[PDB]
């Protein structure tokens, strides 16, 4: 069966809750970087 586009786009609900969670992670990963005195990098944010 040809794959349909229907199964390859995340629902808006999951996207919004994941946006909240991921931006919380980024905020926690940036305020710490202020204290540790380094710029962020692709390595940290690849998981997000």
């Amino acid at each position: 069966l040809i794959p349909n586009l229907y199964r390859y786009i995340q629902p808006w609900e999951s996207e919004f809750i994941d946006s909240q969670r991921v931006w919380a992670e980024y905020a926690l990963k940036r305020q710490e970087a202020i204290a540790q005195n380094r710029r962020l990098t692709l390595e940290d944010l690849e998981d997000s």
């Binding site: 794959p3 349909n4 229907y6 199964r7 390859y8 786009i9 995340q10 629902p11 999951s14």
Partner: peptide, 22 residues
Amino acid sequence: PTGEVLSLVGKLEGTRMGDKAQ
């Protein structure tokens, strides 16, 4: 067998949008 596209109405019993797309 035919190339005509079949409407997936009634074909969504066991599928989700986010499945097979992680």
